Design a protein around this nucleic acid. Sequence first.
RNA 1: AAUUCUUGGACCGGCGCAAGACGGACCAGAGCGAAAGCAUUUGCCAAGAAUGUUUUCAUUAAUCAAGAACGAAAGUCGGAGGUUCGAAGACGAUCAGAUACCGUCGUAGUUCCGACCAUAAACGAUGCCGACCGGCGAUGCGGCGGCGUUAUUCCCAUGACCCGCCGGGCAGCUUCCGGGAAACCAAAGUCUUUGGGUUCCGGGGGGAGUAUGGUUGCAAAGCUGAAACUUAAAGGAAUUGA
Lengths: 57, 225, 547
Amino acid sequence: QTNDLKEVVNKLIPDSIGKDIEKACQSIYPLHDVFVRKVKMLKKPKFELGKLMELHG
Amino acid sequence: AYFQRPENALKRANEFLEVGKKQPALDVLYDVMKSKKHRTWQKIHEPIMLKYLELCVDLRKSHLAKEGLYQYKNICQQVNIKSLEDVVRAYLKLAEEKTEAAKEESQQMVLDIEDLDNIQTPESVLLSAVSGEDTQDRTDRLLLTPWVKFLWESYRQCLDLLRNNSRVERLYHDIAQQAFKFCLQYTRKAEFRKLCDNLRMHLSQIQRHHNQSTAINLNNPESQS
Amino acid sequence: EITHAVVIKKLNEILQARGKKGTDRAAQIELLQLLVQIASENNLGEGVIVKIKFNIIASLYDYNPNLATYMKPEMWQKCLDCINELMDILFANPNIFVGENILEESENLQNVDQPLRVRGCILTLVERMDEEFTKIMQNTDPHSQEYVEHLKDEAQVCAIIERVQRYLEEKTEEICRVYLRRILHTYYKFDYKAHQRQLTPPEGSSKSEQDQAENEGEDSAVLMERLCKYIYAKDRTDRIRTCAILCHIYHHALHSRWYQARDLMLMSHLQDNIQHADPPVQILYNRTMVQLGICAFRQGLTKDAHNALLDIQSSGRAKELLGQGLLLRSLQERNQEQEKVERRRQEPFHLHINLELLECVYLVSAMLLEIPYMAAHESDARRRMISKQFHHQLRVGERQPLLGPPESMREHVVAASKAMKMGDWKTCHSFIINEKMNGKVWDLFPEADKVRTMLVRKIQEESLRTYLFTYSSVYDSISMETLSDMFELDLPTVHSIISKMIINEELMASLDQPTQTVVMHRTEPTAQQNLALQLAEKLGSLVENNE
RNA sequence: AAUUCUUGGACCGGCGCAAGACGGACCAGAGCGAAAGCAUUUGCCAAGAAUGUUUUCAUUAAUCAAGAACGAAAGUCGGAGGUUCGAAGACGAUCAGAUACCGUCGUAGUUCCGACCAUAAACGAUGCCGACCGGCGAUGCGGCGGCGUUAUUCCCAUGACCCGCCGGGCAGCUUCCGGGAAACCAAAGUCUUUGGGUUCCGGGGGGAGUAUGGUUGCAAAGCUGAAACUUAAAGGAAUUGA
């Protein structure tokens, strides 16, 4: 929620989210195979050009 | 089984630093150093270990710099310890260069507002002015002392466990000299241990010799120089 | 919103999950807060809020599950605000707000037992607060900047304990509790606090009615301890006349008279009486008894101070004044100690008192046994600096001193061979910041006591030491050499005639004294009699043995 | 193989859109429920066993003709809906014949709301309440005690493991408890040494759950239920052959 898509995909390339949940749920019941199984894109913004042309270096 | 092609270890460690998560970035590299991939110093092991000890310094963990160097030297035997020597020298240079920057900033920027601060005593220090002294010491402790108790440990570290007797090592007496030169820049109680460690490891030296230990004798370098 | 027919009946449905397991502990103060920020009508948001708030702060303290752990700074400041508002709306509302008939509502709830034990549910809030504040202090690194950031609330606390004190609708009888509280904050407030409310001398400077508002505080121990003592000779408990008097004794020290506070400490007779109280009383007794010896020294009473500060330093377990000392023997009880431990800024410095034993003995050793140390041994005192003197000349490479003991002994030995400035100007180099000179709340008055006590015990060096082949003696120049008041160094040489009985002849109309001291080698065949004494002593003991 | 679909571009591949069903793998001789039965998330509503108890009432209890609540699937009437599958039926094959098995279609139905019907190998083919009589290892829930491991790094303290004990539950293994025609059953045992309490119900096989009367239902049908006549066996467990 707190940051933009470029930084969210940068998190998905490792599994930084999957590590964080595996650390938080140690006290409740220790997990091992914690992955972000899937991501679906539901609604996208108004297609500008400068956004993608700076996402492409 | 975490890694096929141990070059990938660095790719994930760098990829975790794209997020800014240094703990899981370290976790990867430590998990890689300690497994089947003990093939005598692959050219990849230099940047693996160098990034590993960079992260270990930034997180301020002595025990993990101990472990990394202890795994590296085991796999990096006399076949080539040229890289171990450059690894330990780099690790020590990172530690002492960050402490220089830590003194500089916590002894200027925060001590320059401390020159402007309420030195015209408030009651809060008039209670504390029966045990302690100057506010420069009361602040620099908070931001500089955490790094010098890491430096000292990092000098005891590389001298204590990595270099006992060890025939192959001039770098021992290099670190020793550079840590004696460290003493008269900063705190002084990390020198009583310095002298007594040099002595205790001399008592470890002159008794048995059942390794590739120093033949303390006519051999001018290892004994005299 | 409805005439406390919904408010007192929700207050109870939200103050029922207090301390139950699945309450969450956190989203409770919220529901207790949404009964003064949602309540906004007369005695419905304004008047009965005494009760809603009593249960708002009580639950706020209970954000901590443990009672051996410290509160956090956010809820801590929240408490210090939450407590203040109650006091300010209680002052200008002259009524008893858990009962006691006033009009009809919304007070007068005498249906529940009696408005005293929950009318005195106001000080047990601020008393629990004072016991809370100590946890914040005990659980911080003392050398850190967070410690002084935390001590900035010491001022905030002492304003609220003053406000609850001004609230004298008591029924001294039972406000004694917050008198003990108030004096337990002020009893160790130092000279700069005590003196500098009158020591700007009373003229057109500081005796006006609007400035003489903080000079009440030094003569407050006398105002309040008098009551808390002489009412509890009648009243039941032990702690609120014994903590009170030891606060009075400790406060009448460190600025005022040795004679004033010895009468109080003898009056109590705790020397042999305090045996069977609790250690949290036996600790501040030790703090007081150490402050006795320091005050006696600082005054210049340099053997009655030594005769007092023996068994504390004699034992290595002198850490009854500080944090916990040595390792093992009962982890189970060592856990109990680290919440007994006294707060940091209250602790008296320990290389300050090590430099009070090993200087009171320096003035009752480097003088006393120099008269029987002409090979004339039979006055031997084997508990002194010698505990140090044995060991820090028992080594070979000795240069400029660094510690307290060497930086004391290294000019002790050259105070022995009088050298009147070599003995002095090694006690006033870097000691001042090493907590000898500055650390006492007097800058140049402890040294003015000390160096005078040196300048007198450095004419009493010619007495026992340099009198060998002296047949004529000088007196005008001897006081001019040691830059002292001539009479002040005449009266101890006078003492040495009636006390030490030196083999010398006084004729002080001329201000000279011929000595005629010739025992030079008459004393050595009686160095052979020192033992023919032991011969003669025991042949007055062999038949005691035998018959 | 054929009936079917397809150069008015089927099948295969991509991006979307709608629809109505259904909750895989995790899923177990695991759990809950009076039985039928019950599985994506989250919220709301009332219920419930077991455990814990130095709380409370003081025999208020067990089983039950009459009477009553729920009752899979199919099925009937009314409204909404119709993706899949599919009694009827339309064919295509195989076959001596196929009115079936196999294959392409396919109405009722399958799904939801509201009225009915009240039956299943509705099974543990085994009524309920209570007491007594071997051992072992696990398991699900609650409690209790104890080296040690791991997270909260500060570990008080909770969670994940480990070792035992207690009580309720689903089951398992084992034995000359004992029983039984045996298969087998710690209950199907404590039965000629026959008696703890109580409800329902069986009397050789057919005829027959048929006829008839009554009653319930719109219908289908449900509950109660004989006789004449025929017959020497029908049947249960286990053995040896084919």
